């Protein structure tokens, strides 16, 4: 119903509606409501403001209702879904405010929804939300497939780990905060840890102390939230693993309770979920963005100035802590000289180009701002403090960009796409603000009420949602990942049923918006006949194969050089002699190549130079084992695996491709380095010398600031009390420490510690106080936004552009595959796009009463598939604490499914007169049936050592792999699997290269960081003691799963906790310490190399997906 389009009331209402003062008035009122509801606290006028706003909103509802009508069907009041939200909230508030009911806490929460009104009042945001919805409807199949795989691997996880996290180390033979007790009298607890130490019966599992035995008992860790005891919590764990959120602790828990051999589960989960499903999401979203976009005095003297700018940057980089008076006045005088030079620059340029002429250009304004700020600092700096003026001197580094062609084009791209970037930034900010307010209204009272649940001493923790700033920060952290630790606190105070939906909303919608913004940024930036005899020998294919075998053996023999080396007495001798044999073979190869090709041809080849240096490395390793003076040469042998690079054509194509794609990123990388240097100088200015604290030398926790008010109290011992004044491991004392801290913040490992230090600093000798400087968080948010997020788009766009360019250079889709592998690629493309069309003839004459048709009927196949699905469903009902009836019920369900699959197999065997074994999948089904029957009734009579209770259950589940087949499952699943099966060759090559680099670094780390005392990141399972442990550590580092603990342990020497002479029983290596310089080089180099290769992996898969979809 409506009113006549010809009526005085409707006409005037429409007149008011379309008048832009109305839309601006409503917008301003909304923003006032936002501020006074969220970012402001403790007024007294609340009722008047609230009721005035309620009146304004009601007026808006009435006007828009009368103008548009009610239900005309479209372009009416109920046509717009936003009007539904406005009406619902308005009516709810009108009810509650002027009615007997007092749903007061509920009311304010509802009011927060009005923040989303910012979207329909901006046409740009409205259109953006519409297109985002369209893209989300495009993501449906990928979401379903991720749900499918997450459920399957939750089943796999319950089968493998159910109940394990209840393992403890029981004591055998047989006041404070009530929520933080430890049953130390019955179970073993490490000194500092909160939960009982996990331990297992396998030899590759956690070991108990003496006088303790391992028995499953008690509660799970992490307040019961981390476990595989049931579906749902297994789904929680697998979703946490998709996001790779705080995963290293879960790895340690699972590999302590059970054996280290279960790390295959986590590696497979990483590859399938963190890599491949993420690649599919990225491809879908990038294609959607593309579709939307397609729908829519003067001459040659400036060398002096550029040198002056560079020297000024050098002077800025030189300020550090501590600092004497001489080196301080030196920098003061330098500032004077440079600011004078630039003042003269501005004056002369004003003279030459008369005054209007100067400010016509944009760079002159920036230079004038530089001079203006410099002078207004030179004066006014000393008095009143005003230390933040100094913090803007780094703006002068940006002057260096006027002569930089790359910086100019980058800024040009940014400005040209500013219009589109503005809507996305505004939408993301609106969502973050709304979410922060909503979470505060939902959970702040809960955080304060049940405070003791989440903090011993019952004080608010460092991350919460009691007030709005911390709510904003919590949401922002959630958008960076890092959403697991705070969810535990949310659920502890509020509860599972309320926190999980809010956090899922934040996670999913924030991920969508952030990925869309990232794609937008990328798309913006885109716009003697014996001689010939030797030549015959060397080129022969069998000589190559023999040398390759020798290379592989020589490489693999390095993995045996671990702490158990003196325990393996005969292996040591065999290896010492095999080293000489390998040296001899490679020297013979060098000589034969010399004879064949001729020194000039030999050394003129890049690869043969690598071979030659490998030979030198072998020789130096040999000569090193004669004199303990020459002993340090030995380590050089760890360069040996580089031989693998030169001998195999696959490694050569992969290295060629990495050079072709990732080398042209030098200019953009320089821009990014300049950005990071700006932030490092800023951080030195803000924080240098201020992270010092007075701690307990043994316990290591900061003394309460109410006693040690400053250093003088700490240092001066006057009542014979132990207290040490020392720095932090990660500080901002100079630009180098700054670069290390910022790398640790960019990968989000250890960034909470650095920001905790930052928001606690006061002065240069004053004891830091808890959250006294809370707004420094603005430093780190800005760094993440500008020196992490935007540089990443820059680099990735350059790498994608090089990928496409070099692909065009070949007319070939793939460049990471060898020539022999292109035919394989074509063959796979044929197989997974072509019907088999190879049925078999039905036996007719030998046995008439023989219904071949039943098996080949569609009905039979679909019933089989439904049976597979029901088998999978029945698994979810299992749990750890289970009744005795449910156990036998599930046993009989599995038995009946074994029976029914056996009937299937037998009937098929009848149908196809021995062609059953021709089809590969039939062999898989046959093996499934046989193994299932074996395991099900193996303990019937034989009574073997045991059959694991979940083995038959897991064996039956494999048949669900049939859902990814073209004819026997949803058609989308095959389509979404196509990219992996088409990029399998290139992925194999890149994975082999990654494994090679990991191998080199693992051997080097075994040499270096074994015997380092076990501290934060070094523990029983992740350490550099053997090859498997080191490879676990390197994998953990490659996904950024806590490399800061590793380095923190390696820095023990910095911390003065290590014995450089302790005997390590069973090994000739003495000491307990690490080399921080070697540690820094190690980890930084590995992070960079692994990042580059993994990014190229992502590019390969996503480009394949785009290519397939383009058809």
């Amino acid at each position: 119903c409506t009113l006549s389009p010809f009526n005085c009331i409707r006409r005037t209402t429409i007149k008011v509606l379309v008048h832009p003062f109305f839309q601006l008035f409503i917008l301003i009122s909304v923003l006032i409501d936002c501020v006074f509801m969220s970012l402001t606290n403790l007024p007294k006028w609340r009722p008047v403001l609230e009721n005035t706003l309620l009146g304004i909103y009601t007026f808006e509802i009435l006007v828009k209702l009368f103008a548009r009508g009610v239900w005309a069907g479209s372009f009416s009041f109920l046509g717009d879904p936003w009007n539904w939200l406005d009406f619902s909230v308005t009516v709810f508030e009108v009810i509650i405010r002027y009615s007997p009911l007092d749903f007061i806490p509920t009311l304010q929460t509802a009011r927060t929804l009005r923040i989303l009104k910012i979207i329909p009042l901006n046409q740009g945001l409205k259109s953006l939300v519409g297109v985002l919805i369209h893209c989300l409807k495009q993501l449906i199949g990928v979401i379903i497939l991720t749900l499918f795989f997450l459920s399957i691997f939750s089943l796999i996880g319950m089968g493998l780990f159910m109940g394990n996290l209840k393992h403890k180390c029981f004591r055998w033979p047989q006041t404070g905060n009530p929520y933080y007790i430890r049953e130390t009298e019955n179970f073993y607890y490490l000194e500092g840890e909160r939960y009982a130490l996990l331990c297992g019966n396998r030899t590759d599992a956690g070991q108990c102390p003496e006088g303790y035995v391992c028995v499953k008992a008690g509660i799970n860790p992490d307040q019961g939230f981390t476990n595989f005891d049931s579906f749902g919590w297994a789904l929680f764990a697998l979703f946490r693993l998709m996001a790779q959120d705080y995963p290293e602790v879960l790895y340690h828990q699972i590999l302590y309770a059970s054996g280290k051999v279960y790390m295959i589960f986590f590696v497979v989960v990483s590859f399938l979920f963190s890599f491949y499903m993420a690649s599919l999401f990225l491809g879908i979203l990038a294609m959607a963005y593309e579709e939307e976009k397609q729908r829519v005095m003067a001459p040659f003297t400036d060398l002096f100035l550029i040198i002056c700018i560079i020297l000024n940057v050098c002077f800025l980089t030189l300020e550090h802590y501590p600092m004497s008076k001489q080196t301080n006045t030196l920098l003061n005088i330098g500032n004077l000289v440079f600011i004078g030079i630039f003042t003269a620059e501005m004056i002369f340029k004003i003279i030459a180009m008369h005054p209007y002429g100067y400010f016509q250009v944009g760079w002159n304004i920036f230079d004038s701002m530089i001079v203006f700020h410099g002078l207004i600092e030179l004066c006014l700096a000393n008095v009143a403090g005003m230390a933040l003026l100094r913090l803007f001197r780094m703006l002068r580094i940006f002057k260096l960009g006027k002569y930089w062609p790359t910086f100019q084009i980058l800024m040009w791209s940014l400005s040209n796409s500013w219009v589109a970037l503005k809507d996305l930034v505004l939408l993301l900010f609106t969502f973050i603000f709304f979410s922060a307010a909503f979470g505060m209204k939902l959970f702040g009272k809960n955080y304060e009420e049940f405070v003791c649940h989440i903090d011993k001493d019952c004080q608010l923790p460092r991350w919460h949602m009691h007030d709005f700033f911390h709510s904003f920060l919590n949401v922002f952290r959630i958008l960076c990942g890092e959403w697991v630790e705070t969810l535990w606190d949310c659920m502890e105070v509020a509860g599972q049923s309320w926190c999980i939906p809010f956090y899922l909303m934040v996670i999913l919608i924030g991920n969508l918006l952030v990925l869309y913004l990232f794609l937008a940024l990328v798309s913006s930036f885109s716009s003697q006949n014996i001689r010939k005899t030797c030549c015959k020998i060397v080129e022969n294919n069998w000589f190559k194969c023999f040398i390759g075998l020798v290379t592989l053996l020589s490489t693999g023999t390095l993995a045996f050089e671990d702490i158990y080396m003196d325990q393996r007495k005969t292996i040591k001798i065999l290896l010492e002699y095999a080293d000489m044999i390998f040296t001899y073979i490679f020297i013979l190869e060098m000589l034969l190549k010399w004879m064949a090709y001729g020194f000039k041809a030999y050394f003129s080849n890049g690869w043969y130079r690598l071979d030659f240096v490998v030979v030198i490395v072998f020789c130096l390793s040999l000569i090193g084992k004669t004199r303990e003076e020459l002993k340090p040469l030995i380590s050089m042998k760890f360069l040996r695996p580089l031989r693998v690079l030169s001998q195999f054509e696959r490694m050569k194509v992969v290295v060629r491709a990495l050079i072709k794609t990732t080398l042209p990123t030098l200019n953009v990388f320089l821009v990014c380095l300049m950005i990071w240097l700006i932030f490092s100088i800023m951080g030195v200015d803000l924080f240098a010398g201020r992270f010092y604290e007075c701690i307990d030398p043994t316990s290591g926790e900061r003394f309460p600031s109410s006693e040690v008010m400053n250093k003088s109290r700490c240092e001066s011992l006057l009542f014979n009390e132990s207290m040490l004044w020392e720095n932090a491991k990660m500080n901002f004392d100079n630009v180098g420490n700054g670069f290390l801290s910022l790398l640790q913040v960019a990968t989000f490992n250890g960034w909470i510690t650095i920001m905790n230090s930052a928001i606690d600093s006061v002065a240069v000798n004053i004891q830091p106080h808890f959250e006294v400087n809370i707004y420094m968080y603005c430093y780190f948010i800005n760094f993440i936004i500008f020196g992490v997020f935007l540089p990443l788009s820059m680099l990735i766009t350059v790498i994608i552009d090089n990928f496409n360019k070099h692909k065009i250079k070949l007319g070939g889709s793939n460049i990471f595959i060898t020539v022999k592998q292109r035919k394989q690629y074509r063959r796979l493309k044929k197989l997974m796009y072509e019907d088999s069309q190879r049925p078999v003839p039905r036996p007719l004459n030998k046995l008439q009463g023989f219904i071949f048709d039943v098996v080949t009927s569609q009905a039979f196949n679909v019933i089989v598939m439904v049976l597979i699905c029901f088998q999978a469903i029945a698994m979810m009902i299992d749990t750890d604490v289970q009744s005795l009836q449910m156990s036998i019920a599930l046993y009989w369900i599995n038995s009946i499914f074994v029976m029914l699959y056996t009937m299937e197999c037998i009937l098929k065997l009848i149908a196809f007169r021995c062609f059953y074994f021709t089809i590969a999948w039939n062999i898989f089904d046959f093996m499934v049936v046989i193994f299932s029957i074996t395991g099900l009734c193996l303990p019937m009579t034989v009574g073997s050592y045991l059959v694991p209770p979940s083995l038959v259950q897991l064996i039956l589940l494999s048949r669900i792999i049939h859902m990814l087949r073209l004819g026997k499952g949803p058609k989308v699943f095959h389509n979404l699997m196509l990219p992996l099966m088409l990029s399998l060759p290139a992925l194999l090559n890149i994975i082999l290269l990654i494994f090679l680099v990991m191998f080199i670094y693992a051997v080097f780390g075994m040499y270096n960081f074994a015997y380092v005392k076990k501290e934060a990141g070094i523990n029983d399972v992740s350490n550099f003691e053997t090859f498997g442990n080191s490879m676990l550590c390197l994998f953990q580092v490659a996904i950024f799963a806590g490399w800061d603990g590793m380095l923190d342990a390696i820095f023990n020497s910095k911390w003065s906790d290590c014995d450089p002479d302790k005997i390590n029983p069973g090994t000739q290596v003495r000491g307990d310490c690490g080399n921080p310089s070697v540690g820094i080089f190690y980890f930084v180099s590995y992070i960079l190399i692994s990042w580059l290769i993994i990014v190229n992996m992502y590019i390969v898969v996503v480009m394949e997906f785009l290519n397939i979809a383009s058809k």
Partner: protein, 162 residues
């Protein structure tokens, strides 16, 4: 870091000998009070001690007084002992009997782990059997490889020149 490895059972007249003994805890976070004892036994002996650690190194009169040395660790996790000028007569059974007890505020577990060493010093012990056969293996393999290279050089030279 601890890796248990047995001691060498062979000594050469006129040299020092290390009777290695490594007995280390399941967990290395834990502290303990370690009691160490070494015993020696001639063919007619009765296993009388020659050394012991109990609240510090003690002095124990025996035939071994004055020519015994300590090569263990501060954490008493390696209790190896060294003998000087091993003579032909001194041989047989050496026993590294180590007992330690832990502290856990509720119970005090006790453990003993014995380790025995059969020692037979000789006038001149030559190169051990394993190393000699390993060296023979190296030499035969080296010769075979160079022979194979020579054979194929001759073969291909003949074929090419024809």
């Amino acid at each position: 870091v601890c890796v248990e490895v047995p001691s060498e059972t062979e000594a050469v007249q006129g040299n020092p000998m290390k009777l290695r003994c490594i007995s280390c805890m399941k967990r290395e976070e834990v502290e303990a009070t370690t009691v160490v004892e070494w015993f020696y036994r001639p063919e007619g002996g009765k296993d009388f001690l020659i050394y012991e650690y109990r609240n510090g190194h003690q002095e124990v009169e025996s035939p071994f007084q004055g020519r015994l040395q300590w090569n263990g660790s501060k954490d008493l996790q390696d209790v190896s002992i060294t003998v000087l000028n091993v003579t032909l007569n001194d041989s047989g059974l050496y026993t590294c009997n180590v007992s330690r007890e832990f502290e856990f505020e509720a119970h005090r577990p006790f453990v003993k782990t014995t380790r025995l060493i059969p020692l037979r010093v000789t006038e001149e012990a030559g190169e051990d059997f394993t190393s000699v056969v390993s060296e023979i293996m190296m030499y035969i393999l080296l010769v075979f490889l160079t022979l194979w290279l020579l054979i194929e050089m001759i073969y291909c030279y003949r074929k090419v020149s024809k």
